[PDB]
Design brief:
- The structure is cut from a larger assembly and holds five copies of chain A.
- Chain A is mostly helical.
- Chain A has a single domain (9-164), classed as Up-down Bundle (Ferritin).
- The first copy, chain A, contains five helices and no strands.
- In chain A, helix 1 packs antiparallel against helix 2 and helix 1 (9-36) runs antiparallel to helix 3 (86-113).
- Chains in contact: A-B, B-C, B-D, B-E, C-D, C-E.
- The B-C interface holds B 2-4, 28, 31-32, 35-36, 38-41, 59, 63, 66-67, 69-70, 73, 75-76, 78-84 and C 2-4, 28, 31-32, 35-36, 38-41, 52, 59, 63, 66-67, 69-70, 73, 75-76, 78-84.
- Bound molecules: fe (iii) ion (10 copies).
- One fe (iii) ion binds next to helix 1 and helix 2 of chain D.
- Chains A, D: One of its GO terms (biological process) is negative regulation of ferroptosis.
- Chains A, D: The record marks 17 as: Essential for association with cargo receptor NCOA4.
- Chains A, D: Its main location: cytoplasm.
Chain lengths: 166, 167, 167, 166, 167
């Protein structure tokens, strides 16, 4: 690639793996979103919240595909793997976002070891603080749903859906 | 016979008249439910407004079928409109009402299909079938939330639903 | 018995439920008349719009009585709504319909007077009695004009009236 | 009085008694309003609701004083007599409004017996339907507070204060 | 054969080419009618404007079918457009014209149904079948009013209709 400079093959491969994971996270959120749209669940603000999360993750993948091309790497796509209560879904989302953050931190370590400061600052600027805020927000939600009495209390999940996500 | 009548089978004409009576009946059921929740000893005013809007919507459904009857050169035949406890119970009654209306409309579409009346088929599809699907899904959502909130045993649940979903 | 009920006689409560049924019947009659003039073999579209507006007014008359029933602590009891030639003849049928409703309202007011229910008396006076007088005078004006123009023998007359008075 | 016409002495005296009762009702509502402003009760929308009721009743008395002068009667004022939970207060207000309505209906009967149609229509137009709506509204409130679990449930009274009176 | 063609039968392609010619014929008929009423010895200008607008609408019906032909990968085949007394008689000829176009469209839909072409079925339903129903009902309303007013013997009737209905 006529533009490639200081871009290690390990970083390129890791970006491609991270692209797959962000798309996977988007798929997970899409599944959760339409679960809460079911007539026997019917927490429509849970559904909207997860649908917005799904769209954010897809944007996270497209930005990495953009970065791959900017640095002269080559995008390699793989299959996107297929993905009970409002509290349980927030706990799965929290654990999902921590797995994505962990992957991003290992990516940043790789970029650091290969002395790629542009990639390091790109990850810091567009991904690391977003994950921290996403994880903190999901922790806030898990805490409130538990203190209110979820998942045994359906009233708690209804009122949270109205007052926090609505 | 009508100067405008074309490809309009007498069985369709009759079935449209029965569907008009059923839509008017549904409007009557919703009107009763609306003023039940306006009672001073029930007093769930957003349930009442919700059901009153459903009543007006069913009356519009009946009037559009009367319009269609005239458009196709059929003749309207009207019959008596038959006379029609908690917020959850009423939502369940409405859900069953909408599925009974839906079933009739699907039987109407099957008759129109069998008589090769594509205009009536698409008319029913465009103005009624998806309206019923959305109404049934919405009523299913309401029933689920009221159950999950603790209705009918919890009057608090029905109160908060009236405020946060129907209000 | 209601916590809000005060000075509201059982006879008045039953008479209001009967009046609700009559108002819904009148609405049904006007609805029937409206779509008759929408037929392709009658096709007097402003007659149709006029009677449809009357149909909706009668339904508001019934809902306001249902509201009053709840306000006073009575209990709504609904019954079957019974099923209902020229523009002149429809105006004449409407005139008699409104006079029969007026007569029922006047007997209702006499009942409220005899029960010393001044709130019900003023409710009937404010929302119904003058509305009936204006409807009856208007319908008499329409009948008179159609007759003088040469209806029902003159189809031209009914066409021009639809355009110049109801249009 | 140069303006007095068809205005019985019994009607004039009854209007003066009704003036006293409307002022009494205003005093009752003022007491209830500042009870819910107490720091150990603190239902501020209950307090605002009753304060508005207090101001309406005073207006009811001033309109009757106006009517007294319009018909050539003479206003005679008397002492205004001094007047636990949100539900109990609504029940006291409901019973208060029914006592005022009863007094107004006896007033109308008096006006009817004395063949005073102006007074009859004045009472019908400005007082009878207002009482019916006031009594119906208070009945709605009592019903909702009970179905929600008042007075044992303080949560019920808090949420009603926010969602109905707020 | 076309790179875009999918599930588009040869008989459907030919039938659409026949329908195109018929819509163009109908437009020519309305065009003839419009300028007849513009004649100095007929001189019903709103009849003339009404029929000219019908002529333009039929032309658009033909162009949308030509667009559909290209969309589905068919090939347009054009043929000669064949050459086409009172206001009432012209409305009656128009009514009969629209019923013949509707009949042709209904046979078109039966063919599309037989070929399992749901895109074509819904295209016909959405853009043609309900337009035909509305056009036929409107023309029947016009014929009925003209007859009731005393047309065609009454020249006064056709003038007033031209002013109050078409104007
Ligand atoms: Fe992400
Ligand atoms: Fe940095
Ligand atoms: Fe319906
Ligand atoms: Fe709330
Ligand atoms: Fe009425
Ligand atoms: Fe004129
Ligand atoms: Fe007062
Ligand atoms: Fe009066
Ligand atoms: Fe056409
Ligand atoms: Fe369709």
């Amino acid at each position: 690639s006529q533009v490639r400079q200081n871009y290690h093959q390990d970083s390129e491969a890791a970006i491609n793996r991270q692209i797959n994971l962000e798309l996977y996270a988007s798929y997970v959120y899409l599944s959760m979103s339409y679960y809460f749209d079911r007539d026997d669940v019917a927490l429509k603000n849970f559904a909207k919240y997860f649908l917005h999360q799904s769209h954010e993750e897809r944007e996270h993948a497209e930005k990495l595909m953009k970065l791959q091309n900017q640095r002269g790497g080559r995008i390699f796509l793989q299959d996107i793997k297929k993905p009970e209560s409002g509290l349980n879904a927030m706990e799965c989302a929290l654990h999902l976002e921590k797995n994505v953050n962990q992957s991003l931190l290992e990516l940043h370590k790789l970029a650091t070891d290969k002395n790629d400061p542009h990639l390091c600052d790109f990850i810091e600027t567009h991904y690391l603080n977003e994950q921290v805020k996403a994880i903190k927000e999901l922790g806030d939600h898990v805490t409130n749903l538990r203190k209110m009495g979820a998942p045994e209390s359906g009233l708690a999940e209804y009122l949270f859906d109205k007052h926090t996500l609505g």
